[PDB]
Symmetry: C4
Subunit: 327 residues, 4 copies
């Protein structure tokens, strides 16, 4: 009844508080939402359009263009047809977007106006490039990527090849592969060291074959991950009855390079002591039909009872062999 | 005669069925075909062009512009020269593309029309950016990348340095390298555990040197991968005659970071029991000519018989030594 | 009092000198600062605008356009309305930016002028593309990325589970995870080999569990890294009093794939002999409140004394057991 | 005198011949040279500009526009001011580039002409996007990236800590780090197995500490890589005199994730038997000056003689100890 450290869906159940400070662009960019980033960029356009519009309007005002927007034989405006702020605003937009309808058109008359068109051209170009890049950042780096990996709802304890094992099933929801895929597991419980030190949650490795490289998996059809419960296992002393009492949690991990997303992935899940099914085995999901193999995923989470499974702990199992040898 | 789990070309022979649900953009993007994605984008242009065209047409209609498109001394249209829907449509296109010929040109007269030009400018800019990004997504993340790695058509069993070995050849088709390249192999067969549990396809590691780090290869010219068949090998009890009987499959893997594609790669192949050549050795592909080394790839798949190869299993080989020692 | 090889913040304290030579674009690009890269691109625009402007001006000059910019019935200019260098300059800008107001407009009259517009169009397009790319390079590859990982200010020496240990704490400042995270540590001191060879700084591994795969960590809430001090440890012979004398440094590393930045990361820190707190333990940062777990980061760096901690070295600790056994 | 398998600069000395076939875009793109890719894109522009120009010219021809380009009260051209092929060509360019000067301007008159402007707009947009992407491909994936890692010109054999060792030096030419850096080495020679099989070049691991994880290095200042020559070493039986006779090659590798280029890297070099200096040691490159450490890279390749170095092989060294024990 303690609590869930990692949720069934992989989400971690911890919140951070009281964090100190630092007084980056790429991370900041991908962290913001679409609607806000698009609002941001449209704001960037408006502001720059309005700014230059204001400048061209000032220039026109001072030059006397407002009273002679089309010019004549004796008089040439800085920008043709700026008759007021709305016109200046339009000329700004038309310049920066590069629409350039041309009714409002810069002339050779004013160095400053020519300068301002050069500047706005460069700015408009810079802004666009930043928008193209930010849109790719948030594009190729989404926070929501759909889980490509499935863990079974339950783990189970059963005999395989003379050994009592903790077992859980992993699967790939896509035809795409996972490169250099490998698995890990941890038992999560609080504990007090013999020296009296309290460890709120201790993370204790569950051996899935790392030392022989057998934690490395080639995952096509769903695979059943195996933990042999032995002297070195944290579950060594745990019997079926201990299970309905004990408060602990097992975190399971699958890591690898997903050929779809191109990025290294960590898929997570969790089994509470109460979510482990003793004396059970998974229903087979894999079937061969003539020319081809098929996986039926509706059997993925399903299990069946194996009543011949011993109800004592692995430690009892071992100790009993040594007890009936000597006598 | 059972069936092929992995095809010679690396393709996996399994199909998934009965999958449950989830109710992403980047993955969705790269999964669609070119012609459809290009059709999609052209559709995006049409729709937005038609939409704004419709809006400018409504504005023109209500303002009375249709009857005075060029305006006069007493009357100024919202957008010059919109005389009907085709003209409005053109003005829309010309605005969003930023072509801006200028015959059809927005004026200062109508706040709403100016507003709409601003909006369309932003939208056109957003659309373009998404097209530039999607085209890179599908660009830098192709599904068809040409296999850069070659496995020999056959594996073989022969003596090397006093040991009976399973051997197969791998090669790089490019001058480009593979960083942190390493190999793996698995024997694939169904089996029943002593407890009566049926495993439709069990995946059993074939030791290629992982424990000594010898599974790690520096691949320039083709290399012959070696599996010593010993007590711990699944092939320990298999003789030449067992081979023409037995139903099983060996999957071979090569993983590494391809310096060409920049992405971590898994190259796969398969050898059926019937595709393993007992008492054979690969023809050498590597030759030194004066100043330089050359590889002749026409010898890559070729093998020759070594009649002195023992036809008994490795287990017989060992057991026989112990049988002629003691006597 | 020797010196700091690695700073507390991970920065390395070494400078390179007397480096020889090589007589790339992507690296060169990301190495330059924003303001200089933006200045660079604006310079690229100016230069190309000025160049073509000069060319159109020459063409106009030679054709006689300067004296008849608008043309007439008997005479057609190469580019309409180029009346001087400022006009030519404007036409250049208007062409390359694709603003194209159209008052200055190329005609069918001069093959060379048409040619030049084609060329400038291609160049302007090339320049833009390079600017869009460079801006992404520097965008997705920043030098300043905010440290996502925290090391405790101090390490400590205390008993855990019957063993004297060197301990330090690591933490993730973000809810984002670290894929395939693992840790390392080194003792840095100069030394002289028995053969008389001087090694200015020798880097000696501190065992954090690599051989059992226990150097691999699943990091959610802060974790305390453990080095058991034993026969094989460089700290085996070091007591509490040796600590206030000895001159040495311990470098701690955490490597992994950060799910935020998408890139493989190396976080670093350092503990001088004087920064190690003997007979101390870290304050717990992790607390369970009902439905959820919380981390209080204000306790991250904090420690408390454990007076029962032995002040002798691990070697003394061992040797003393063997001394009181035999008697 | 045999030959060089790997050049001092890391380049591999092998050429492939007689390769079979496959009947991708991203790889193909980055493989082509700049000048050709830029020529390619400019060709793409020309072709599309010429094509549509031809179409608008046909349309104009058939409509009768060539004889009335400006139109009048009773007659409206499909595109204003197309008076011939040069004009049509200009209108094409002006449309696709989106310059849109506007002297040549499409009208509402011809559905086909409007259609063609829509099509060309989409095509021009597609072409541009492909150019922006290809330029990034070749941008972020260069073939020439400057070597960031240096190997010493020579290896050496000397005693360190009671053991005869093969040694070579590696260094980072940049302040940038290498994440998860690790080293490897191989002895390359042809050999004949006891069964009579010829291996043109056999690649035999040289143990740099892989089993203890000591092949993993934290590289700041140059480091001297160590191979202890022992029973399991291929160099076990090699003395100083054997060195001036023997024909063999040692390939050295350094792999890691370069924080600069963001990509996993393999740096390579080679030492011929003749390039190994027996009874030598590297000059120290690292020096501490007060507040800071410095590396002098002009000492990087330099070595000095250690006359006390034994000239016999490691095997002799061992065997001699056992010879003077027993007597
Ligand atoms: C009123 C809100 C209008 C608006 O801004 O919606 C944006 C939409 C909403 O996304 P949202 O912000 O909910 O997503 P996050 O929660 O992950 O941030 O996101 C797009 O896909 C735009 C794709 C644009 C594709 C254009 C080419 C087809
Ligand atoms: C009628 C079909 C017209 C059309 O859309 O063909 C597109 C072509 C077809 O590709 P396809 O869809 O067969 O490929 P996938 O099966 O992998 O999806 O794909 C390009 O290379 C476009 C490159 C454009 C390059 C432009 C600059 C040169
Ligand atoms: C006078 C200096 C004017 C100017 O050039 O400042 C640039 C600014 C300064 O950056 P700085 O060069 O200091 O950064 P580095 O030290 O890392 O190089 O960098 C931006 O963020 C531009 C973001 C542009 C975003 C545009 C869309 C909103
Ligand atoms: C006559 C040849 C004209 C021409 O095309 O030269 C291109 C130049 C030559 O490169 P080159 O083809 O020799 O390089 P590779 O051997 O690696 O392919 O490459 C650029 O940097 C263009 C950078 C353009 C940057 C534009 C913005 C400043
Ligand atoms: K334009
Ligand atoms: K334009
Ligand atoms: K125009
Ligand atoms: K090991
Ligand atoms: K990796
Ligand atoms: K225009």
């Amino acid at each position: 009844c303690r609590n869930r450290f990692v949720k069934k869906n992989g989400q971690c159940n911890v919140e951070f508080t009281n964090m100190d400070d630092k007084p980056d662009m790429f991370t900041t960019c991908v962290d913001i939402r679409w609607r806000y980033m698009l609002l941001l960029f449209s704001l960037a356009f408006l502001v720059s359009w309005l700014l230059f519009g204001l400048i061209f309007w000032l220039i026109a005002l001072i030059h006397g263009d407002l009273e002679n927007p089309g010019g004549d034989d004796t008089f040439k405006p800085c920008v043709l047809q700026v008759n007021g702020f709305v016109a200046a605003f339009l000329f700004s937009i038309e310049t920066q977007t590069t629409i350039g309808y041309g009714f409002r058109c810069v002339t050779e008359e004013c160095p400053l106006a020519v300068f301002m068109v050069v500047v706005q051209s460069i700015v408009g170009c810079i802004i666009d490039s930043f928008m193209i890049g930010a849109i790719m950042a948030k594009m190729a780096r989404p926070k929501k990527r759909a889980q490509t990996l499935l863990f079974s709802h339950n783990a189970v304890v059963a005999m395989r090849d003379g050994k009592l094992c903790l077992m859980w099933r992993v699967g790939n929801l896509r035809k795409s592969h996972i490169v250099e895929a490998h698995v890990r597991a941890q038992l999560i419980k609080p504990r007090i060291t013999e020296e009296g030190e309290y460890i709120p949650l201790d993370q204790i490795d569950i051996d899935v074959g790392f030392d022989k490289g057998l934690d490395r998996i080639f995952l096509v059809s769903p695979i059943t991950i195996l933990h042999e419960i032995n002297e070195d296992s944290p579950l060594f002393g745990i019997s079926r009855q201990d299970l309905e009492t004990d408060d602990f949690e097992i975190v399971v991990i699958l890591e690898g390079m997903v050929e779809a997303t191109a990025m290294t992935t960590q898929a997570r899940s969790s089994y509470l002591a109460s979510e482990i099914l003793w004396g059970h085995r998974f229903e087979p999901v894999l079937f061969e039909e003539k020319n081809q193999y098929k996986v039926d995923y509706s059997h993925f989470h399903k299990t069946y009872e194996v009543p011949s499974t011993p109800r004592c702990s692995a430690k009892d199992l071992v100790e009993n062999k040594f007890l009936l040898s000597n006598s």
